[PDB]
Amino acid sequence: ERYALGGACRVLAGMPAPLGATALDGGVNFAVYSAGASAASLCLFTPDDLEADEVTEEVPLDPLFNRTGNVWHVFIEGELHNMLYGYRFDGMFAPHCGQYFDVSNVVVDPYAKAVISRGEYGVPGPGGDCWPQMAGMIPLPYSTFDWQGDLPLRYPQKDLVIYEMHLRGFTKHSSSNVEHPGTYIGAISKLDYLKELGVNCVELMPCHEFNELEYFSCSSKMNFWGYSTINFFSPMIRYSSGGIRNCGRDAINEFKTFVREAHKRGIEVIMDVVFNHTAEGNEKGPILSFRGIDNSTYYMLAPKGEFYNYSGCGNTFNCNHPVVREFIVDCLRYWVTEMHVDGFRFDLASIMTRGCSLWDPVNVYGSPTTTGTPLATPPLIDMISNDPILGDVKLIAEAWDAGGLYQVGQFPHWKIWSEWNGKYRDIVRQFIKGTDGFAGGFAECLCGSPHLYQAGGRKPWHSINFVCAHDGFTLADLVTYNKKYNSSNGEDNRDGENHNLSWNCGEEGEFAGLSVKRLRKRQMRNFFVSLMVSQGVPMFYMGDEYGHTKGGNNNTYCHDHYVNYFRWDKKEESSDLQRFCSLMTKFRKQCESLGLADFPTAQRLHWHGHQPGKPDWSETSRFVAFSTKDETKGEIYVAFNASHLPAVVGLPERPGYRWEPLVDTGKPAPYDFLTDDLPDRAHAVHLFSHFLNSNLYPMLSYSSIILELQPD
Amino acid sequence: ARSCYRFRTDDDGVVDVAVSGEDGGYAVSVEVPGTRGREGGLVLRASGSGEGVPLAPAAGGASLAAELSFDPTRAPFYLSFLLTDASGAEIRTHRKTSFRVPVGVGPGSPAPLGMSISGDGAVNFAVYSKNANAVSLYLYAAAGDEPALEIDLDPYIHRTGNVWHVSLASVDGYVSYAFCCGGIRRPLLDPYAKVIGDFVSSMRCFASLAIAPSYNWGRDRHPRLPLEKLVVYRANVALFTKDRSSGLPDDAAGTFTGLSAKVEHFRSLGVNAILLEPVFPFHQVKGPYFPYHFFSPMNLYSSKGLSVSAIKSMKDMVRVMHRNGIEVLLEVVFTHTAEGESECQTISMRGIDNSSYYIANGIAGCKASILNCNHPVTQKLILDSLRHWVLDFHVDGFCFINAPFLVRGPGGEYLSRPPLLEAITFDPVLSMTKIIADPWSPLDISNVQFPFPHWKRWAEVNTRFSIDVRKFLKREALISDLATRLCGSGDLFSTRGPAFSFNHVSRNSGLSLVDLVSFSNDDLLSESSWNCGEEGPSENSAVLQTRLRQIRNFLFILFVSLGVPVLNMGDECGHSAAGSVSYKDRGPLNWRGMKTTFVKEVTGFISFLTALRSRRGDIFQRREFLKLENIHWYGSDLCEPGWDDPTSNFLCMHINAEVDSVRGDLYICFNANEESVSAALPALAEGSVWLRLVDTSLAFPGFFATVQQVPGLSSYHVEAHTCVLFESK
Numbered sequence A: 001e002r003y004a005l006g007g008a009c010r011v012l013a014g015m016p017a018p019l020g021a022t023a024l025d026g027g028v029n030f031a032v033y034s035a036g037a038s039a040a041s042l043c044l045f046t047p048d049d050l051e052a053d054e055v056t057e058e059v060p061l062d063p064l065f066n067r068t069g070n071v072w073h074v075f076i077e078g079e080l081h082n083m084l085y086g087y088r089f090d091g092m093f094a095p096h097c098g099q100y101f102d103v104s105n106v107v108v109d110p111y112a113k114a115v116i117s118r119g120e121y122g123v124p125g126p127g128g129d130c131w132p133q134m135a136g137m138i139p140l141p142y143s144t145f146d147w148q149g150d151l152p153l154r155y156p157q158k159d160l161v162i163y164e165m166h167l168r169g170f171t172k173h174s175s176s177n178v179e180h181p182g183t184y185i186g187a188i189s190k191l192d193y194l195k196e197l198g199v200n201c202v203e204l205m206p207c208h209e210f211n212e213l214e215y216f217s218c219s220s221k222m223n224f225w226g227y228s229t230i231n232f233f234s235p236m237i238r239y240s241s242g243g244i245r246n247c248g249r250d251a252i253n254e255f256k257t258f259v260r261e262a263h264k265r266g267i268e269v270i271m272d273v274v275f276n277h278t279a280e281g282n283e284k285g286p287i288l289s290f291r292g293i294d295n296s297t298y299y300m301l302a303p304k305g306e307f308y309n310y311s312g313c314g315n316t317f318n319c320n321h322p323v324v325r326e327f328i329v330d331c332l333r334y335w336v337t338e339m340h341v342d343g344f345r346f347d348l349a350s351i352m353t354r355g356c357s358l359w360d361p362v363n364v365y366g367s368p369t370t371t372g373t374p375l376a377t378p379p380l381i382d383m384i385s386n387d388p389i390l391g392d393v394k395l396i397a398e399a400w401d402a403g404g405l406y407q408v409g410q411f412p413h414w415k416i417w418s419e420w421n422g423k424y425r426d427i428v429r430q431f432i433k434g435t436d437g438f439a440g441g442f443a444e445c446l447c448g449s450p451h452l453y454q455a456g457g458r459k460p461w462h463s464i465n466f467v468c469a470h471d472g473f474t475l476a477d478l479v480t481y482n483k484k485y486n487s488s489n490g491e492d493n494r495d496g497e498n499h500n501l502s503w504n505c506g507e508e509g510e511f512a513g514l515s516v517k518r519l520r521k522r523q524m525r526n527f528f529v530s531l532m533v534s535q536g537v538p539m540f541y542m543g544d545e546y547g548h549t550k551g552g553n554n555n556t557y558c559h560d561h562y563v564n565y566f567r568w569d570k571k572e573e574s575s576d577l578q579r580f581c582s583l584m585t586k587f588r589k590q591c592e593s594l595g596l597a598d599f600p601t602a603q604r605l606h607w608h609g610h611q612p613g614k615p616d617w618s619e620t621s622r623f624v625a626f627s628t629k630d631e632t633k634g635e636i637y638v639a640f641n642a643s644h645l646p647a648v649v650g651l652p653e654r655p656g657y658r659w660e661p662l663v664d665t666g667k668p669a670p671y672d673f674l675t676d677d678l679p680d681r682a683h684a685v686h687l688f689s690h691f692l693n694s695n696l697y698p699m700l701s702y703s704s705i706i707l708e709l710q711p712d
Numbered sequence B: 001a002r003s004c005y006r007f008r009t010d011d012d013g014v015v016d017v018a019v020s021g022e023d024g025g026y027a028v029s030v031e032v033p034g035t036r037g038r039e040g041g042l043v044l045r046a047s048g049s050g051e052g053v054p055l056a057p058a059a060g061g062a063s064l065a066a067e068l069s070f071d072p073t074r075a076p077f078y079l080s081f082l083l084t085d086a087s088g089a090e091i092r093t094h095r096k097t098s099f100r101v102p103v104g105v106g107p108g109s110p111a112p113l114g115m116s117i118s119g120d121g122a123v124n125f126a127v128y129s130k131n132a133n134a135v136s137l138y139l140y141a142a143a144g145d146e147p148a149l150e151i152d153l154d155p156y157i158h159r160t161g162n163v164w165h166v167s168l169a170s171v172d173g174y175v176s177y178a179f180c181c182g183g184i185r186r187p188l189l190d191p192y193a194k195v196i197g198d199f200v201s202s203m204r205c206f207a208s209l210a211i212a213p214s215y216n217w218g219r220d221r222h223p224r225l226p227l228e229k230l231v232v233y234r235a236n237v238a239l240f241t242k243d244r245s246s247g248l249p250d251d252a253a254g255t256f257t258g259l260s261a262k263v264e265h266f267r268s269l270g271v272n273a274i275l276l277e278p279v280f281p282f283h284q285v286k287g288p289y290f291p292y293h294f295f296s297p298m299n300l301y302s303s304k305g306l307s308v309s310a311i312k313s314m315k316d317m318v319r320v321m322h323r324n325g326i327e328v329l330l331e332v333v334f335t336h337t338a339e340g341e342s343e344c345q346t347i348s349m350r351g352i353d354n355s356s357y358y359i360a361n362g363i364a365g366c367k368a369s370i371l372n373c374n375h376p377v378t379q380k381l382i383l384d385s386l387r388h389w390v391l392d393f394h395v396d397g398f399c400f401i402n403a404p405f406l407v408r409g410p411g412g413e414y415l416s417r418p419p420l421l422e423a424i425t426f427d428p429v430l431s432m433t434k435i436i437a438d439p440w441s442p443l444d445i446s447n448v449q450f451p452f453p454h455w456k457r458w459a460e461v462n463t464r465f466s467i468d469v470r471k472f473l474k475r476e477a478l479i480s481d482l483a484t485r486l487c488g489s490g491d492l493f494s495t496r497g498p499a500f501s502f503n504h505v506s507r508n509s510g511l512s513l514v515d516l517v518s519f520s521n522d523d524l525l526s527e528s529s530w531n532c533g534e535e536g537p538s539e540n541s542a543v544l545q546t547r548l549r550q551i552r553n554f555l556f557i558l559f560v561s562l563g564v565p566v567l568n569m570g571d572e573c574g575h576s577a578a579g580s581v582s583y584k585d586r587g588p589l590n591w592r593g594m595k596t597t598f599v600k601e602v603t604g605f606i607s608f609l610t611a612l613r614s615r616r617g618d619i620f621q622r623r624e625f626l627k628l629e630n631i632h633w634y635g636s637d638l639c640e641p642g643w644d645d646p647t648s649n650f651l652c653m654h655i656n657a658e659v660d661s662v663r664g665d666l667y668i669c670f671n672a673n674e675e676s677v678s679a680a681l682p683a684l685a686e687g688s689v690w691l692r693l694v695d696t697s698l699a700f701p702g703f704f705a706t707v708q709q710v711p712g713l714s715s716y717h718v719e720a721h722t723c724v725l726f727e728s729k
C-alpha cells in the first residue's frame, strides 16, 4: 500500500500498455519502455513548480511490481490532469557503449501528447535558458473538442493540388490583419483565400514540438522551419495563442480547430513529419526524451558508441528497430485518428529504408547485413503501407538523405507510396530555362513520369510534381538569381543546393531592365503552366502564387523575419500573377484530361512540333507541344516554346473546328488568361482571328500557350 | 445524446446532419449553412419521394434547416436524401452520392480492434478488411439461427482507412455477433474476439458479447525460473486426465482443473515446467494443431464446455501452477489454421480478408491454409495474441510449433530477415517470457534444416539429440555423436549455452519409450528403434530385461546430458502407443500403472536423476559449456576411445568437479554393445573413493543408490546395454 500526493493519491501496479499516460478508471496509467534502466521513478510537477525546475512529487517504481518485461508502469488514482509528468531513470553511464543513464535528468515521455517548456515563440526561459525543464501533459478522462461531425474528405489523389505552407509564416506578418498572427487560429482566417486560390490540400511544414532557440544560445539564430523534433506525439505549443495554458491542452485543441476548419472548406491536411532524427543531436547534445531512456535502442550507433549521421543533423533515428517501428506507427495512427490528419510527407524518407544493427550476424547467430544498409523491403515501410489505418492515407516520401542515398522512382512503395519527384523538378527547371537535350525528358515529365512509376505498378498521381519547395529557390528567385546568397545563414555561404538549375533571365538581382522583368513574368507563368498541365499532383510552396522573394537565399531555415513570411501586402501588388495561378488551377480542375488516373495513351495525347504531328526530340529541340482529347473541353492544345526565338506554330487541322485562345503567358495581364469576366474577350479573340483562321499562333520566346477546340 | 455528420457537397458547401435519439424515435436535423450556391432556397428530397420537407430559415437566414422524425422501435436504418434548389437542380455529396446518414447506430471508432465497451455503455465494433468493400454486423440473441439484427455499415461513415467500425447504444437482448464481408451471407468470427461460442460444421462460430469477468490473481507471481534450472513435462490437457483411472469427477477429467489436480504428481518427478499442447480452439476433425482462433482457450477443456468457463479454468490452473513453483508453457501454432480454400471451411479470416491473412494458394502438397505470418496485419494479430496470453493468462513461455515456417515470406521464399521473429524477440512486454523454436511440423511437408535465428534468446527443441541417442543405443552411430550430444550439443548452441538445448528422446508423436524398445520394423526405420530381439510384446525374459535396461539408458542419457530435459506425457509410466507413429493414435493416460513396480522404478529413477541435476547444479544446470580441461574421454581401460571406429559402442566420461565447499568428480560409462566390457575407474586423491550411484543392470533396491564404495583405479565390469554413474567422495 502506497500513496503519491501527500497521501491523497493511491499508487497501484498499473499495466504495461498502451505506452504513455492514459486516463483510466478514475486515475492515470503511465507506461514507458526502457531496457537498460535498472531503476526508474515518475516525477510529477505543478506548472509553477516546473517553472522553477523543481519536482513536486516523485514516485519510485519497484522493479518487481512496476515492470513487466522492459516496460516500466505505474497507476495513480486521482485528478492528475492539472499536473505534468516525466521520468527519472537510473542505469549505466557509458558513452563508449551507448548508455547515457543519469538520475539527475528528468526526461519527457516519448508518448506524451504535449510538452510544456515555454509559452512564447522566441522568448527564452527564466534567465535566458533556452533549454528549461520540460514535462508532459497528463490526459483528462474525456475529450474536450467538438469535431462537429467532421468526416474524412478522401479526395482521390489525382484531384489534389498541394500547397506547402509554414504555419507561423503564413500569418505572422503585420499585413495579415489577423487576430493572432503566426498561430493556428490566425491561419484559420485565410483558408478562404486558399480555397479561392484553387488549393484543396495544405502540406504543413513541421508542426511537431521543437525548440526554436536551439541555435540561439550559441550564435543568435532561430530554428524557423522546425526540422528537429523533440516530441513526435505533441504539436508545437508556440504555434498556438494559448501557449502553455491548461497544461497545453488548449494548444492541442487549437491545432484540432485548424484541421476542422480546413475540412469545413474542403481542404485536406498533410503533416510534414521528421522521423529520421531528433533534437538531441550527437553525444554532445541535450538529453530530453530518448537518450535518457534508451539511447542504444532509439539511435543508430557504430560499434564504438559513435552516432551514425545519415540525416546530416547529428544523429539518426533507429527507424527499423522493432520498438522504434511500433513507436512510429503508433504516432502516425494517433495523428490520423485523434487529430484527423489526411496524410504525411516523410522528410528524408530514405533513412527509413536503412537497416538496423539487430540483423548484424554478431547479434543474431552470435557470430559471423550491417547497420545503415538500404533494404529492399524495409520493415517500417512495410508496416506503414499495410497498416489497417495508415494504408489508406497519403504517404509522400522525400526519397533521399544526407548519407548519399537517392531513391526517386525506387522507394519501396508496395504500389501505395507517392514521392517528391525531384527528377521532375530538375527536368522542368532545365527545360523551361532554355537548356539543350530536355525535350524528351520534359515530355516524359508532362505525362506523369511513366519511365519511373509505370513499370513498378504505380499511377501518374503517385508522382508529386513540384518546381519549388521550402528548401531551395522560390519561384521568383528561380528566375532572378543564378547562384545562392546564403551569407546571412552565417556559415560562409556553405548552405543549400549548389546546383540550382536557375537563370536570372538576363541581368541578376531585382534591379533589371523592363525586358528582363517581362521575361521573368513569362517564366513564372510558364513554370506554373507546366506544373498545372502535367500528369501527377501539382505541389507548390506558399508565396509562389504572387512571386515571393527571399533575396536569393535558398536556405532560410534560421530566419524568423519577413524573408520567410507570407507578405499579404505584396500579394496585392502582384495580384496579376495570383489571378493567373488561380485561373490555371481552376482550368486544371475543369479539364477531364489533366488529372488522369492512368498514364496518357497515344489515343488521347498527340505530340506536335512547330508543325502538327512532327515533334522535334533531338538534343537541339527547345519546343514541346501536344494536343489532348478532353471530355469537357473537346480538345486542348498546349505548347511550350523554351527557345530564345519567336515562332508562328501551326495548329492541328480539325475540319469544322477552330482553335480559340485561352492562355498565353506573353500577353499583358489580364489577357495572359482569357475569361468571360473580361468584357472585351471577344474583341481580343477577334484581333488574333486572322492567325487562328489559318491554324497558326505567334509565340514569343520562352512562353507557353493553351488553346481549346471550339466548333466552327 | 447526438451524432453529427458533416457532408461536403459538390457545389462548395456543407450539410450538417445531427441524429438524436429520443427518450424513443429519432430526430434528424439537417442544416445547410453558407449561401450563394443555394441562392433561392432548397428542399430536402428524402429518397426523392413526393415529400421533401422544404428547408426554412432556421438561424438568421444564414443557416437554413429542416427537421425530420422517425418512429421508435425501428431497427437501425439509413436516411438517404438529396437537396434540390429552387430551380430543379440537384445537390449531391462531393462523391456524387446522396447524403446518407445512419439512424440507430453511431459512427464508432477504429480502435481497439474487436469489440469494446465504452464509458457510457455503448458497444464499439471494429474489424479490418481491405479486400471487402461491404461489411455488415449480425447480432444474434439467445436461442438464434438467423441474425436477430443486421446492421450494414456505410463505407464512408463506418470506415477509417481499412477498418470498418460501428458503435451501438447497447446490446441488451443480444448474446453474440458476427461479421458479413463482401456480400456473402455467411457469418464470420471476429479475429480479435476474446470470448467465442461453440463451433458448428459449412463452418460457423460467433463471438460472444459477454465480457470475461475480472480475474482475481491474488498474490500470483511468475516463477521466473532460470532456463538452466528447467525440467519440462509436455502434457495434453485432454488425454492427461480424461481417463477414469485418474480418479477425477466427470467434466473435471480432461480439463484444466484435472491438470491442476495432479500438481503433486508433477512435483514428485522434480518437474517445474509443464508444456501444454495447443489450447487454441481447433477443429475436432484435424486436431489441436490446426487452430481457428488465437485469443481464448478451447471450450472442450472447460468443465461446463463453454469458453468463459474455459478462460476461468485455465487461469485457475495457471494460478495453481504458479503458486506451486511450476511454470506454464503453451505450444502455439501460428503457421496455419484449420480454415479451407472453399467457402464451407471459411469461418474467421479466410472470409474477412484472405489476401492478407494467408499465402497465395498456400504451399505445395498441403490443403491447410498457410498464414501470411510476415504480413504486418498478421504480425499484429500474432503479437497481440502473445501479449494477451502473457498479460492476461500469466503464461511463462511459448513453444512455437513449426517454427522454421515462420521465416518464410509471402511468396513461399525463405527470408534472410524474418520480421515476425524479430518482433517477437524484441517485444517489450515479452522480454521476460521464454520462447522456444520447435522444428516439428503437424503438416506433411518437411521444410529444411537451416540456421534458425535466435539472437541468443530463442531456445530450440533438439531433434538431433533424439536421433543420435537412439542410434547410439541401437549401435549405428559413432561415439563422437554421443559425446557431442552429452556436452550440450555445442555445434548448434555454441553461442548460446547448453541450457538453450531442449533435449528429448520421445515426443507426443512417434514412438514412446516402451515403443522404441519393442516395435522395430521396416516402416519404423525412421524412428531408429530396436525391437530387442522380437517385434511386439513378448515373454522372452532376456528380451524384457534388455528392454528395461534400454528404457533406463534412455532416461539416464536424457537426464545426464547438458540441456533442458523434456519429458513426454506417459514416458514415466510406459504409455504404449501400440506401434503407431501418429500423435492422433495416442490415448488417455492410464493412471493405474502408477501403483506397479515398473512405473515405481521409472518414476523413482526420474526423480533421482532430477535430484542429481538439482544438487550438482555446477555440472548439469550450467549457463555455459563445461571447460575443455574438466572433461575426459576413456574406453575399456582408461584409453583413447575409438571415435572413428563404428564397431566400438562403449564410452566413458570423466568430469572433474571444478572447485572454484568441496565437489566430487563424476564418471559415466555408456555401453550399448551386445557384450560386456571392462571400465578402469580414474585416479582419486587419497581418502576419496568412487560411489556407484547408477547401474542399470540391477534390481530396484540398488538401481539408483542415493552405497557401494570402490577404490580409485579399480576395474568395474559394465554389463551389455547399461549405463553406470559414479561420484567421487
Ligand SMILES: OC[C@@H]1O[C@@H](O[C@@H]2[C@@H](O)[C@H](O)[C@H](O[C@@H]3[C@@H](O)[C@H](O)[C@H](O[C@H]4[C@H](O)[C@@H](O)[C@@H](O[C@H]5[C@H](O)[C@@H](O)[C@@H](O[C@H]6[C@H](O)[C@@H](O)[C@@H](O[C@H]7[C@H](O)[C@@H](O)[C@@H](O)O[C@@H]7CO)O[C@@H]6CO)O[C@@H]5CO)O[C@@H]4CO)O[C@H]3CO)O[C@H]2CO)[C@@H](O)[C@H](O)[C@H]1O
Pocket (backbone or CB within 6 Å): A129, A130, A131, A214, A215, A217, A218, A223, A225, A227, A228, A274, A276, A279, A280, A281, A282, A284, A285, A286, A309, A311, A312, A313, A314, A347, A348, A398, A471, A495, A555, A557
Ligand atoms: O532532415 C531535415 C532536412 O534538413 C532541413 O533543413 C535543415 C534543418 O534540419 C537544420 O536546421 C539544419 O541545420 C544543421 C543542423 O541541423 C546540424 O546541426 C548541422 O551540422 C552540425 C552542426 O554544426 C552542429 O549542430 C553539430 O554539433 C552540435 C550538436 O549536433 C548539437 O546537439 C549541440 O548540442 C547542444 C550544445 O551542446 C549546446 O550548445 C546547447 O546550447 C546551449 C545550451 O543553452 C546549454 O548547453 C548552455 O549551457 O550552453 C549552450 C551553448 O553553448 O544546445 C545544443 C543543441 O541544442 O552540440 C553541437 C554544437 O556544438 O552537429 C551537426 C552535425 O550535423 O548544422 C546545420 C547546418 O544547416 O540545416 C537545414 C538545411 O536545410 C530541410 O532543408 C530538409 O527538408 C530536410 O530534409
Ligand SMILES: OC[C@H]1O[C@H](O[C@H]2[C@H](O)[C@@H](O)[C@@H](O[C@H]3[C@H](O)[C@@H](O)[C@@H](O)O[C@@H]3CO)O[C@@H]2CO)[C@H](O)[C@@H](O)[C@@H]1O
Pocket (backbone or CB within 6 Å): A433, A434, A435, A482, A501, A502, A503, A504, A506, A644
Ligand atoms: O543556351 C544558348 C542559346 O541560348 C542563349 O540564350 C539564353 C539561354 O537560352 C538560356 O538558357 C540562358 O543560359 C543560362 C542557363 O540557362 C543557366 O544555366 C545560367 O545560370 O547561365 C546561362 C546564361 O548565363 O541565357 C542565355 C543568354 O544569356 C543565346 O541567346 C543563344 O544564342 C544560344 O544559342
Ligand SMILES: OC[C@H]1O[C@H](O[C@H]2[C@H](O)[C@@H](O)[C@@H](O[C@H]3[C@H](O)[C@@H](O)[C@@H](O)O[C@@H]3CO)O[C@@H]2CO)[C@H](O)[C@@H](O)[C@@H]1O
Pocket (backbone or CB within 6 Å): A439, A440, A441, A443, A444, A447, A450, A599, A600, A601, A602, A605, A606, A607, A617
Ligand atoms: O503519346 C503517348 C506517349 O507519350 C509519351 O511518349 C513520348 C515521350 O514522352 C517523349 O519523350 C518522346 O519519346 C521519344 C524520345 O524523346 C526520342 O529520343 C526518341 O528516341 O523517340 C521517343 C519516342 O519515339 O515522344 C514519345 C511519343 O512519341 C509517354 O512517355 C508514353 O508513355 C506515351 O505512350
Ligand SMILES: OC[C@H]1O[C@H](O)[C@H](O)[C@@H](O)[C@@H]1O
Pocket (backbone or CB within 6 Å): A400, A401, A404, A406, A422, A426
Ligand atoms: O544525390 C543526387 C541528388 O541529391 C539530392 O536529393 C538533390 O535533391 C538532387 O538534385 C541530386 O541530383
Ligand SMILES: OC[C@H]1O[C@H](O)[C@H](O)[C@@H](O)[C@@H]1O
Pocket (backbone or CB within 6 Å): A312, A400, A401, A402, A403, A471, A497
Ligand atoms: O534537395 C534537398 C537537399 O537537401 C537534403 O536535406 C538532402 O540531404 C540533399 O541531398 C538535397 O540536395
Ligand SMILES: OC[C@H]1O[C@H](O)[C@H](O)[C@@H](O)[C@@H]1O
Pocket (backbone or CB within 6 Å): A312, A402, A494, A495, A496, A497, A555
Ligand atoms: O551543410 C548543411 C547542409 O545539409 C543538408 O544536406 C542540406 O541539404 C543543405 O541545405 C545544408 O546546408
Ligand SMILES: OC[C@H]1O[C@H](O)[C@H](O)[C@@H](O)[C@@H]1O
Pocket (backbone or CB within 6 Å): B479, B480, B481, B483, B484, B633, B643
Ligand atoms: O566428439 C568428440 C570428438 O572430437 C573431440 O574434440 C575429441 O578429439 C574426441 O572426443 C573426438 O574426436
Ligand SMILES: OC[C@H]1O[C@H](O)[C@H](O)[C@@H](O)[C@@H]1O
Pocket (backbone or CB within 6 Å): B483, B484, B485, B487, B489, B490, B491, B631
Ligand atoms: O567432448 C566431446 C566433444 O563434444 C563436442 O561436440 C565438442 O566438439 C568437443 O567438446 C568434443 O569434440
Ligand SMILES: OC[C@H]1O[C@H](O)[C@H](O)[C@@H](O)[C@@H]1O
Pocket (backbone or CB within 6 Å): B483, B484, B487, B488, B489, B490, B491, B493, B494, B625, B626, B627, B628, B631
Ligand atoms: O561448443 C562447445 C563444445 O565443446 C566444448 O569444449 C564443451 O566442453 C562442450 O560442452 C561442447 O560440446
Ligand SMILES: OC[C@H]1O[C@H](O)[C@H](O)[C@@H](O)[C@@H]1O
Pocket (backbone or CB within 6 Å): B490, B624, B625, B626, B627, B628
Ligand atoms: O567450455 C569450454 C570452452 O572453451 C573453448 O575454448 C570454447 O569456448 C568452447 O569450445 C569450449 O566449450
